[PDB]
């Protein structure tokens, strides 16, 4: 009778659809699949010689494990190329330094076996780096966190990076899956000086004609302040800007510093960070450190989805995959549904369904381990917001939410959803201002 969720643990999930099935590939050579994005089936969980994705993995990827001095793999991407085969961009990292290698493996079938084609990037060397100059982690990337994608003109690209020298994009050979020659680490999009920015992902939206670069700010752990951000560009390889028109290219921590959160915070649209709808007298959903996302555009239905992992209030470091639907606002920026996907769609909303009291989450613009708390507001029939904040609300057309709060104009959507914690239907809104600040309302 009610939505059924079956949970899986896939860190850094990278979504791929093939033959009517969705798969996510993550770190530690973990993977899961689903037909409906709600009920997931765990397929693999860890690197070992009995992992079916890569038979005898420690021999198959011997060189990568040797360079990285690790027994595991970090965030994988799988992408199907024109030859119909599946290309896995694998990587490993020592973890205490950007000592890493990235390579590609290929499989006839989605669930493997994947066979190594070779390493094509390294970082953390003492001498000459991939761009011809000696390796410097303040300006050169850690060669991890790949996501490979086609642009609107059939060109193949790979964006990648975590911390260290920043986020880079490489143009790739559509026939071999390897980078085209003579690019070094490729073209820098942002980052440097050990900025807490990783997990880059690009999704082209045909309806707005923008490429959207999703990013994770902060650290992935429960005290890390992980949050999902986004910027956009006319071209796949930049330049990228945020909602205020800040160029992302200059976003980085100060020279001579490590993990300068204060310098990067003001840049990029912040879609989601730690939050809870729960109060002393009411249960509610809540995430700690949501991040490392991929995204999927469904060509049949036209809907978009954010796929990520998250931790949870009170549950330490345990993580699960979550899916939230994305909607494009008037300004051409996405907003996330406040609740995980349960088959909802943008339907007609009537003003009679909107008026009432809402719990309000303001995700803000910071990198903070502080779990955002709700405040109460009222959306009144006279098209005014009153309560712990004030302004005006109006429904544009079918379900577009034009809301003003604290003298700032927000745009997004009204959306009826399922609350899987309270197990009730809720009216929600999800909106975003020109400063890239996101607000969630739940009634
Ligand atoms: Ni990723």
Short mmCIF file of C-alpha atoms and ligand atoms in Angstrom, two decimals:
data_model
loop_
_atom_site.label_atom_id
_atom_site.label_comp_id
_atom_site.label_asym_id
_atom_site.label_seq_id
_atom_site.Cartn_x
_atom_site.Cartn_y
_atom_site.Cartn_z
CA UNK A 1 0.00 0.00 0.00
CA UNK A 2 2.84 2.42 0.90
CA UNK A 3 6.27 3.10 -0.69
CA UNK A 4 8.80 0.33 0.01
CA UNK A 5 12.47 1.23 0.35
CA UNK A 6 15.29 -1.31 0.39
CA UNK A 7 18.55 0.27 1.46
CA UNK A 8 22.10 -0.27 0.21
CA UNK A 9 25.58 0.93 1.18
CA UNK A 10 27.54 2.21 -1.80
CA UNK A 11 29.94 5.00 -0.93
CA UNK A 12 30.34 7.66 -3.63
CA UNK A 13 27.58 6.23 -5.86
CA UNK A 14 27.96 6.68 -9.61
CA UNK A 15 24.65 6.09 -11.41
CA UNK A 16 24.31 4.30 -14.75
CA UNK A 17 21.20 3.03 -16.55
CA UNK A 18 21.41 0.11 -18.95
CA UNK A 19 18.74 -2.28 -20.27
CA UNK A 20 15.99 -0.89 -18.03
CA UNK A 21 18.01 -1.28 -14.83
CA UNK A 22 19.79 1.33 -12.71
CA UNK A 23 23.19 0.57 -11.22
CA UNK A 24 25.39 2.49 -8.81
CA UNK A 25 29.12 1.91 -8.57
CA UNK A 26 30.99 3.32 -5.60
CA UNK A 27 34.21 3.02 -3.65
CA UNK A 28 35.66 -0.31 -2.49
CA UNK A 29 34.38 -1.82 -5.72
CA UNK A 30 30.88 -1.76 -4.22
CA UNK A 31 27.78 -1.77 -6.39
CA UNK A 32 24.00 -2.12 -6.27
CA UNK A 33 21.04 -2.14 -8.67
CA UNK A 34 17.41 -1.09 -8.78
CA UNK A 35 14.55 -0.94 -11.25
CA UNK A 36 12.65 1.86 -9.49
CA UNK A 37 15.32 3.88 -7.60
CA UNK A 38 13.58 2.96 -4.34
CA UNK A 39 14.29 -0.74 -3.85
CA UNK A 40 17.99 -1.36 -4.26
CA UNK A 41 19.75 -4.71 -4.34
CA UNK A 42 23.31 -4.90 -2.99
CA UNK A 43 25.63 -6.65 -5.50
CA UNK A 44 29.16 -6.14 -4.11
CA UNK A 45 30.64 -4.44 -1.04
CA UNK A 46 34.45 -4.71 -0.88
CA UNK A 47 37.68 -5.30 -2.79
CA UNK A 48 38.71 -8.96 -2.68
CA UNK A 49 39.62 -11.78 -5.07
CA UNK A 50 36.03 -13.06 -4.81
CA UNK A 51 34.47 -9.78 -6.03
CA UNK A 52 32.85 -10.75 -9.36
CA UNK A 53 33.28 -7.32 -10.99
CA UNK A 54 37.03 -7.83 -11.32
CA UNK A 55 38.14 -11.47 -10.94
CA UNK A 56 41.50 -11.78 -9.17
CA UNK A 57 41.51 -8.00 -8.70
CA UNK A 58 44.81 -7.81 -6.81
CA UNK A 59 46.58 -9.25 -9.86
CA UNK A 60 44.44 -7.51 -12.47
CA UNK A 61 45.15 -4.08 -10.94
CA UNK A 62 48.50 -4.96 -9.35
CA UNK A 63 50.25 -1.80 -10.56
CA UNK A 64 47.59 0.55 -9.19
CA UNK A 65 47.63 -1.08 -5.76
CA UNK A 66 51.43 -0.90 -5.82
CA UNK A 67 51.63 2.77 -6.78
CA UNK A 68 48.94 3.77 -4.30
CA UNK A 69 50.08 1.39 -1.56
CA UNK A 70 46.49 0.40 -0.80
CA UNK A 71 44.31 -2.71 -0.74
CA UNK A 72 41.15 -0.89 -1.88
CA UNK A 73 39.77 1.28 -4.66
CA UNK A 74 38.11 4.67 -4.32
CA UNK A 75 35.20 6.25 -6.22
CA UNK A 76 34.64 4.38 -9.50
CA UNK A 77 32.72 5.62 -12.55
CA UNK A 78 31.23 3.25 -15.14
CA UNK A 79 30.23 4.61 -18.55
CA UNK A 80 28.96 2.85 -21.65
CA UNK A 81 30.70 3.95 -24.85
CA UNK A 82 29.62 3.72 -28.51
CA UNK A 83 30.96 0.16 -28.88
CA UNK A 84 28.35 -0.90 -26.32
CA UNK A 85 30.97 -1.96 -23.79
CA UNK A 86 31.20 -0.71 -20.20
CA UNK A 87 34.24 1.29 -19.17
CA UNK A 88 35.16 1.50 -15.50
CA UNK A 89 37.42 4.34 -14.44
CA UNK A 90 39.08 2.94 -11.37
CA UNK A 91 41.44 4.60 -8.93
CA UNK A 92 43.29 4.00 -5.69
CA UNK A 93 44.90 6.34 -3.17
CA UNK A 94 47.23 5.81 -0.22
CA UNK A 95 44.88 8.02 1.81
CA UNK A 96 47.44 10.01 3.81
CA UNK A 97 48.65 11.78 0.68
CA UNK A 98 47.70 12.19 -3.00
CA UNK A 99 49.63 9.02 -3.91
CA UNK A 100 47.25 7.72 -6.54
CA UNK A 101 46.74 6.03 -9.87
CA UNK A 102 43.77 6.06 -12.24
CA UNK A 103 43.10 3.53 -14.98
CA UNK A 104 40.38 2.02 -17.12
CA UNK A 105 38.90 -1.48 -17.25
CA UNK A 106 36.35 -2.76 -19.77
CA UNK A 107 33.49 -5.27 -19.62
CA UNK A 108 31.12 -6.71 -22.21
CA UNK A 109 28.38 -6.85 -19.57
CA UNK A 110 27.49 -4.32 -16.86
CA UNK A 111 28.09 -6.63 -13.89
CA UNK A 112 31.48 -7.63 -15.32
CA UNK A 113 33.95 -9.06 -15.59
CA UNK A 114 35.99 -5.89 -16.04
CA UNK A 115 39.45 -6.38 -17.51
CA UNK A 116 42.29 -3.89 -17.11
CA UNK A 117 43.34 -1.77 -20.09
CA UNK A 118 45.91 0.18 -18.05
CA UNK A 119 46.83 3.13 -15.85
CA UNK A 120 46.77 6.55 -17.55
CA UNK A 121 47.19 9.03 -14.67
CA UNK A 122 49.36 9.16 -11.54
CA UNK A 123 49.82 11.63 -8.68
CA UNK A 124 51.99 11.78 -5.56
CA UNK A 125 55.23 11.04 -7.42
CA UNK A 126 58.38 12.69 -6.12
CA UNK A 127 59.57 13.76 -9.58
CA UNK A 128 58.01 14.83 -12.88
CA UNK A 129 54.19 14.88 -12.91
CA UNK A 130 51.77 14.06 -15.73
CA UNK A 131 51.82 17.68 -16.96
CA UNK A 132 55.61 17.68 -17.42
CA UNK A 133 56.49 19.67 -14.29
CA UNK A 134 57.52 18.22 -10.89
CA UNK A 135 54.52 17.09 -8.80
CA UNK A 136 53.13 19.77 -6.47
CA UNK A 137 49.92 18.84 -4.62
CA UNK A 138 48.97 22.53 -4.26
CA UNK A 139 48.51 22.87 -8.03
CA UNK A 140 48.29 19.30 -9.31
CA UNK A 141 45.28 17.07 -8.65
CA UNK A 142 44.88 13.88 -6.71
CA UNK A 143 43.95 11.59 -9.61
CA UNK A 144 40.74 10.23 -8.07
CA UNK A 145 36.97 10.75 -8.28
CA UNK A 146 36.45 10.38 -12.05
CA UNK A 147 33.22 10.93 -13.87
CA UNK A 148 33.23 10.42 -17.62
CA UNK A 149 30.43 11.87 -19.77
CA UNK A 150 29.40 12.75 -23.34
CA UNK A 151 28.65 16.41 -24.11
CA UNK A 152 25.84 17.59 -26.41
CA UNK A 153 28.14 17.29 -29.46
CA UNK A 154 29.23 13.69 -28.91
CA UNK A 155 32.62 14.58 -27.43
CA UNK A 156 33.70 12.44 -24.47
CA UNK A 157 35.07 14.11 -21.31
CA UNK A 158 36.27 13.16 -17.83
CA UNK A 159 36.12 15.49 -14.85
CA UNK A 160 38.00 14.46 -11.72
CA UNK A 161 39.78 15.52 -8.55
CA UNK A 162 39.79 15.56 -4.77
CA UNK A 163 41.43 18.17 -2.57
CA UNK A 164 45.09 18.87 -3.48
CA UNK A 165 45.45 20.95 -6.64
CA UNK A 166 41.77 21.02 -7.51
CA UNK A 167 39.29 19.87 -10.13
CA UNK A 168 40.35 19.13 -13.71
CA UNK A 169 38.72 18.01 -16.96
CA UNK A 170 40.25 15.89 -19.73
CA UNK A 171 39.00 15.18 -23.25
CA UNK A 172 38.75 11.46 -23.91
CA UNK A 173 39.03 9.14 -26.91
CA UNK A 174 35.49 7.79 -27.56
CA UNK A 175 36.96 4.61 -29.10
CA UNK A 176 39.40 3.59 -26.34
CA UNK A 177 38.12 5.45 -23.27
CA UNK A 178 41.60 6.89 -22.66
CA UNK A 179 42.43 10.60 -22.61
CA UNK A 180 43.49 12.16 -25.92
CA UNK A 181 47.26 12.71 -25.94
CA UNK A 182 49.23 15.65 -24.56
CA UNK A 183 46.82 17.15 -22.03
CA UNK A 184 48.74 16.42 -18.85
CA UNK A 185 46.29 16.66 -15.95
CA UNK A 186 43.99 18.56 -18.29
CA UNK A 187 42.13 21.83 -17.90
CA UNK A 188 41.53 23.20 -14.41
CA UNK A 189 37.95 24.18 -13.55
CA UNK A 190 38.52 25.19 -9.91
CA UNK A 191 40.39 24.36 -6.71
CA UNK A 192 43.97 24.37 -5.43
CA UNK A 193 45.92 24.66 -2.17
CA UNK A 194 44.18 21.64 -0.63
CA UNK A 195 40.62 22.99 -0.84
CA UNK A 196 38.02 20.64 0.63
CA UNK A 197 36.39 20.11 -2.78
CA UNK A 198 35.95 16.70 -4.40
CA UNK A 199 33.54 14.38 -6.22
CA UNK A 200 32.97 16.43 -9.40
CA UNK A 201 30.08 15.39 -11.64
CA UNK A 202 28.72 16.98 -14.83
CA UNK A 203 25.16 16.72 -16.14
CA UNK A 204 23.99 18.50 -19.28
CA UNK A 205 20.42 19.78 -19.19
CA UNK A 206 19.04 20.15 -22.74
CA UNK A 207 16.11 22.28 -21.58
CA UNK A 208 18.33 25.07 -20.19
CA UNK A 209 21.34 24.26 -22.41
CA UNK A 210 23.74 24.46 -19.45
CA UNK A 211 26.29 21.93 -18.22
CA UNK A 212 25.98 21.56 -14.44
CA UNK A 213 29.08 20.77 -12.36
CA UNK A 214 28.12 19.16 -9.06
CA UNK A 215 30.69 19.18 -6.24
CA UNK A 216 31.13 18.09 -2.65
CA UNK A 217 32.46 20.70 -0.19
CA UNK A 218 33.95 19.72 3.15
CA UNK A 219 34.80 16.35 4.66
CA UNK A 220 32.75 13.18 4.27
CA UNK A 221 32.79 12.20 7.94
CA UNK A 222 30.09 13.01 10.49
CA UNK A 223 32.01 16.10 11.66
CA UNK A 224 33.13 17.07 8.15
CA UNK A 225 30.32 19.36 6.98
CA UNK A 226 29.92 17.55 3.65
CA UNK A 227 27.45 19.36 1.41
CA UNK A 228 26.42 19.23 -2.24
CA UNK A 229 27.15 22.23 -4.44
CA UNK A 230 26.73 23.11 -8.10
CA UNK A 231 27.95 25.53 -10.77
CA UNK A 232 27.22 25.83 -14.49
CA UNK A 233 28.81 26.56 -17.86
CA UNK A 234 27.90 26.94 -21.55
CA UNK A 235 30.62 24.43 -22.43
CA UNK A 236 31.55 21.12 -20.76
CA UNK A 237 35.10 22.30 -20.02
CA UNK A 238 34.14 25.66 -18.52
CA UNK A 239 34.31 28.37 -17.56
CA UNK A 240 31.96 27.54 -14.67
CA UNK A 241 30.15 30.15 -12.60
CA UNK A 242 27.78 30.09 -9.61
CA UNK A 243 24.41 31.85 -9.33
CA UNK A 244 26.01 35.18 -8.40
CA UNK A 245 28.24 34.90 -11.46
CA UNK A 246 31.39 34.16 -9.46
CA UNK A 247 33.93 32.37 -11.67
CA UNK A 248 34.70 29.01 -10.04
CA UNK A 249 38.21 28.96 -11.51
CA UNK A 250 39.60 31.20 -8.76
CA UNK A 251 37.87 29.37 -5.90
CA UNK A 252 40.54 27.93 -3.61
CA UNK A 253 42.06 28.04 -0.15
CA UNK A 254 44.81 30.55 0.60
CA UNK A 255 48.41 29.77 -0.27
CA UNK A 256 50.36 28.14 2.56
CA UNK A 257 47.19 26.72 4.12
CA UNK A 258 45.49 23.33 4.21
CA UNK A 259 41.72 22.80 4.15
CA UNK A 260 40.80 26.49 4.15
CA UNK A 261 37.01 26.15 4.35
CA UNK A 262 36.41 29.87 4.89
CA UNK A 263 37.87 30.89 1.51
CA UNK A 264 35.77 28.47 -0.60
CA UNK A 265 32.47 28.72 1.34
CA UNK A 266 31.07 31.79 -0.41
CA UNK A 267 31.30 30.20 -3.88
CA UNK A 268 28.98 27.77 -5.65
CA UNK A 269 25.28 27.07 -5.19
CA UNK A 270 24.64 24.98 -2.06
CA UNK A 271 21.85 22.45 -2.74
CA UNK A 272 21.95 20.34 0.41
CA UNK A 273 23.87 19.94 3.66
CA UNK A 274 23.22 18.41 7.07
CA UNK A 275 19.63 18.91 8.24
CA UNK A 276 16.86 17.43 10.34
CA UNK A 277 13.10 17.89 10.27
CA UNK A 278 12.79 16.11 13.61
CA UNK A 279 11.72 18.13 16.64
CA UNK A 280 11.15 17.29 20.31
CA UNK A 281 7.48 16.54 19.62
CA UNK A 282 7.75 15.20 16.05
CA UNK A 283 9.78 12.66 14.09
CA UNK A 284 11.35 13.71 10.81
CA UNK A 285 13.92 12.85 8.17
CA UNK A 286 17.50 14.00 8.57
CA UNK A 287 20.92 13.67 6.95
CA UNK A 288 24.50 14.19 8.15
CA UNK A 289 27.15 14.95 5.49
CA UNK A 290 25.24 14.22 2.29
CA UNK A 291 27.51 14.21 -0.74
CA UNK A 292 29.60 12.67 -3.50
CA UNK A 293 26.76 12.67 -5.94
CA UNK A 294 26.03 11.64 -9.45
CA UNK A 295 22.94 12.69 -11.38
CA UNK A 296 20.61 11.15 -13.92
CA UNK A 297 18.44 12.67 -16.62
CA UNK A 298 15.55 10.41 -17.64
CA UNK A 299 14.87 10.93 -21.35
CA UNK A 300 11.51 9.14 -21.30
CA UNK A 301 9.91 10.98 -18.38
CA UNK A 302 12.04 14.14 -18.50
CA UNK A 303 12.72 13.97 -14.75
CA UNK A 304 16.15 14.52 -13.15
CA UNK A 305 17.61 12.86 -10.06
CA UNK A 306 20.39 13.43 -7.56
CA UNK A 307 22.09 10.21 -6.39
CA UNK A 308 24.41 10.42 -3.40
CA UNK A 309 25.38 8.79 -0.12
CA UNK A 310 24.68 10.24 3.29
CA UNK A 311 25.21 9.64 6.98
CA UNK A 312 22.44 10.14 9.56
CA UNK A 313 21.88 11.89 12.90
CA UNK A 314 22.85 9.54 15.73
CA UNK A 315 24.18 6.75 13.48
CA UNK A 316 27.86 7.69 13.33
CA UNK A 317 29.64 6.82 10.09
CA UNK A 318 27.16 4.38 8.58
CA UNK A 319 25.99 5.49 5.15
CA UNK A 320 23.28 4.65 2.65
CA UNK A 321 22.40 5.62 -0.91
CA UNK A 322 19.72 8.26 -1.33
CA UNK A 323 17.90 9.54 -4.41
CA UNK A 324 16.19 12.95 -4.53
CA UNK A 325 14.40 14.35 -7.56
CA UNK A 326 15.76 17.58 -9.04
CA UNK A 327 13.71 20.44 -10.51
CA UNK A 328 14.99 23.40 -12.56
CA UNK A 329 13.95 26.84 -11.31
CA UNK A 330 13.17 29.96 -13.38
CA UNK A 331 16.79 31.09 -13.22
CA UNK A 332 18.09 27.80 -14.62
CA UNK A 333 19.36 26.37 -11.32
CA UNK A 334 18.29 23.04 -9.80
CA UNK A 335 16.46 22.59 -6.50
CA UNK A 336 16.26 19.26 -4.65
CA UNK A 337 13.07 17.68 -3.39
CA UNK A 338 13.15 17.80 0.43
CA UNK A 339 12.23 14.09 0.64
CA UNK A 340 13.78 11.06 -1.07
CA UNK A 341 12.19 9.86 -4.29
CA UNK A 342 9.04 7.80 -3.81
CA UNK A 343 7.44 8.10 -7.25
CA UNK A 344 6.27 11.70 -6.90
CA UNK A 345 5.93 13.98 -9.90
CA UNK A 346 5.34 17.69 -10.39
CA UNK A 347 1.54 17.78 -10.33
CA UNK A 348 -0.86 20.71 -10.27
CA UNK A 349 -0.92 22.27 -6.81
CA UNK A 350 -3.88 24.37 -5.63
CA UNK A 351 -3.49 27.31 -3.24
CA UNK A 352 -5.96 25.55 -0.93
CA UNK A 353 -3.31 22.85 -0.49
CA UNK A 354 -0.48 25.33 0.20
CA UNK A 355 -1.70 27.54 3.04
CA UNK A 356 -0.72 26.44 6.54
CA UNK A 357 2.33 26.01 8.75
CA UNK A 358 5.68 24.82 7.40
CA UNK A 359 8.85 23.55 8.99
CA UNK A 360 11.65 25.46 7.27
CA UNK A 361 15.22 24.30 6.62
CA UNK A 362 17.71 26.93 5.47
CA UNK A 363 20.79 25.09 4.21
CA UNK A 364 22.73 28.35 4.09
CA UNK A 365 26.07 28.90 2.40
CA UNK A 366 28.58 27.56 4.91
CA UNK A 367 30.64 24.42 5.40
CA UNK A 368 29.49 23.36 8.87
CA UNK A 369 29.09 20.14 10.82
CA UNK A 370 26.11 21.76 12.55
CA UNK A 371 22.88 19.97 11.66
CA UNK A 372 20.43 22.59 10.38
CA UNK A 373 17.25 22.95 12.46
CA UNK A 374 13.72 23.89 11.42
CA UNK A 375 11.91 27.16 12.02
CA UNK A 376 8.16 27.70 11.67
CA UNK A 377 6.50 29.95 9.14
CA UNK A 378 2.96 30.41 7.82
CA UNK A 379 1.96 30.81 4.19
CA UNK A 380 -1.26 32.84 4.33
CA UNK A 381 -4.12 33.27 1.83
CA UNK A 382 -3.23 36.95 1.44
CA UNK A 383 0.03 35.82 -0.22
CA UNK A 384 2.19 36.86 2.73
CA UNK A 385 4.62 34.81 4.79
CA UNK A 386 4.52 35.37 8.53
CA UNK A 387 6.20 33.82 11.56
CA UNK A 388 9.87 33.41 12.40
CA UNK A 389 10.50 35.03 9.01
CA UNK A 390 8.39 37.27 6.76
CA UNK A 391 7.81 38.01 3.08
CA UNK A 392 5.45 37.03 0.27
CA UNK A 393 4.55 33.78 -1.48
CA UNK A 394 2.79 33.02 -4.72
CA UNK A 395 2.24 30.03 -6.95
CA UNK A 396 3.23 30.70 -10.55
CA UNK A 397 1.35 28.61 -13.09
CA UNK A 398 1.01 24.91 -12.28
CA UNK A 399 3.39 24.61 -9.32
CA UNK A 400 6.21 27.15 -9.51
CA UNK A 401 7.07 28.62 -6.11
CA UNK A 402 7.99 32.31 -6.05
CA UNK A 403 8.83 33.09 -2.41
CA UNK A 404 10.40 36.08 -0.68
CA UNK A 405 12.18 35.66 2.66
CA UNK A 406 14.30 38.18 4.57
CA UNK A 407 14.16 40.55 1.60
CA UNK A 408 15.56 37.88 -0.73
CA UNK A 409 13.70 36.41 -3.72
CA UNK A 410 13.60 32.60 -3.93
CA UNK A 411 12.38 30.49 -6.86
CA UNK A 412 11.59 26.79 -7.01
CA UNK A 413 8.62 24.42 -6.80
CA UNK A 414 5.66 23.30 -4.70
CA UNK A 415 5.60 19.51 -4.49
CA UNK A 416 3.43 16.98 -2.72
CA UNK A 417 5.68 14.23 -1.35
CA UNK A 418 5.92 11.18 0.88
CA UNK A 419 7.61 11.46 4.30
CA UNK A 420 9.00 7.96 4.84
CA UNK A 421 9.79 8.63 8.52
CA UNK A 422 6.41 10.01 9.62
CA UNK A 423 4.88 7.83 6.88
CA UNK A 424 2.56 10.62 5.81
CA UNK A 425 2.00 12.69 2.69
CA UNK A 426 3.32 16.22 2.91
CA UNK A 427 3.11 19.42 0.92
CA UNK A 428 6.63 20.73 0.38
CA UNK A 429 8.43 23.52 -1.34
CA UNK A 430 12.05 23.69 -2.42
CA UNK A 431 13.45 27.02 -3.53
CA UNK A 432 16.73 28.81 -4.24
CA UNK A 433 17.77 32.49 -4.31
CA UNK A 434 20.30 34.27 -6.53
CA UNK A 435 22.92 33.80 -3.82
CA UNK A 436 22.68 30.02 -4.16
CA UNK A 437 20.98 29.51 -0.80
CA UNK A 438 18.45 26.67 -0.62
CA UNK A 439 15.30 26.58 1.52
CA UNK A 440 13.05 23.57 2.20
CA UNK A 441 9.49 23.82 3.47
CA UNK A 442 7.52 20.88 4.84
CA UNK A 443 3.84 21.00 5.78
NI1 LIG B 1 31.25 10.58 -7.67
#
